[PDB]
Design a protein around this ligand. Structure first.
Ligand code: FBP
Ligand code: MG
Length: 306
């Protein structure tokens, strides 16, 4: 069960590219570290969600059989650096995340879409309805959490596509914690108690949403998702090919295993994880590790030497 090391390795390599302005270098260092370390853990695993396909993205592709070959079969999802932008620009909130579940329990690869997603902590889990307007979701979650609607804090990615959403949430008088990248940590923060974030809502990336669903399954809470295309061209494509885009995906629908493992390691100083500190002896790396069987969330600061 050497899994944590992976993300830690991912951060460590990636940590040496912070502020440097090169994004591909950080992604590549993190991917190389995580690959070289995961192919050594006694674990046969298929990457259902990763960097990409077997063409331009050479490393950490979908369908890659990772591990030394031993152990039980399992679905594997990895974001080497969530918010690579923030890594290269030397800004806060950047992590290396990894989710592991039973074989076949993670959400469909299928075709490459974005994902509209809305998540809340265990408090108001059963009252989410992603098809309802954000007004009703905010009001329901507010009453359930015993909050006034003015003190609700919705986390939304600061994009042009979400502008309307912004306005709507601002109509209910609710606060919006606009972030720039990384809705995995944002969803985990929404499902974190006393974290300031009560709810996440927005159209982010499907891999991030599936890994966040694994995390939410581990720690408790609920995320609902609808697939979404980037342009009208892909909406049309989904129409000829029979994609029920109106379909709602739950937390279990994305990751439906029984043992669910989610570990992140901070690259830069994030809200839920401190970045990698380098000193001549080695480096300190902070990580979070969550298991579904036990519900024990473990926050681990690790000291490394050479
Ligand atoms: O940045 P986009 O393309 O608008 O989509 C946002 C997605 O990018 C991410 O920030 C991923 O980080 P990177 O793109 O920097 O690798 C996700 O968290 C988020 O879902
Ligand atoms: Mg990324």
């Amino acid at each position: 069960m050497e899994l944590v090391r992976v993300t830690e390795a991912g951060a460590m390599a990636a940590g040496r590219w912070v502020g440097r302005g090169d994004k591909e270098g950080g992604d590549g260092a993190a991917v190389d570290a995580m690959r070289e370390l995961v192919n050594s853990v006694s674990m046969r695993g298929v990457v259902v969600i990763g960097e990409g396909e077997k063409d331009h993205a050479p490393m950490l592709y979908n369908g890659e059989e990772v591990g030394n070959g031993d152990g039980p079969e399992c679905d594997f999802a990895v974001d080497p650096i969530d918010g690579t932008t923030l890594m290269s620009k030397g800004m806060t909130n950047a992590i290396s995340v990894l989710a592991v579940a039973d074989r076949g329990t993670m959400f469909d690869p299928s075709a490459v879409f974005y994902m509209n997603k809305i998540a809340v902590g265990p408090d108001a889990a059963h009252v989410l309805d992603i098809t309802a307007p954000i007004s009703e979701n905010i009001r329901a979650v507010a009453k359930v959490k015993d909050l006034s609607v003015r003190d609700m804090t919705v986390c939304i990615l600061d994009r042009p596509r979400h502008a309307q959403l912004i306005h709507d949430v601002r109509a209910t008088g609710a606060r919006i914690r606009l972030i720039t990248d990384g809705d995995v940590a944002g969803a985990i923060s929404a499902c974190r108690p006393h974290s300031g974030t009560d709810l996440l809502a927005g159209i982010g990336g499907t891999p991030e949403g599936i890994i966040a669903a694994a995390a939410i399954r581990c720690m408790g809470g609920a995320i609902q998702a609808q697939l979404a295309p980037r342009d009208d061209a892909e909406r049309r494509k989904a129409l000829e090919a029979g994609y029920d885009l109106n379909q709602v995906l739950t937390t279990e629908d994305l990751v439906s295993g029984e043992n669910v493992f989610f570990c992140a390691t901070g690259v830069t100083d994030g809200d839920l994880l401190k970045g990698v500190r380098y000193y001549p002896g080695g480096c300190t790396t902070h990580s979070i590790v969550m298991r579904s069987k036990s519900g024990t969330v473990r926050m681990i600061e690790a000291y490394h030497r050479l």
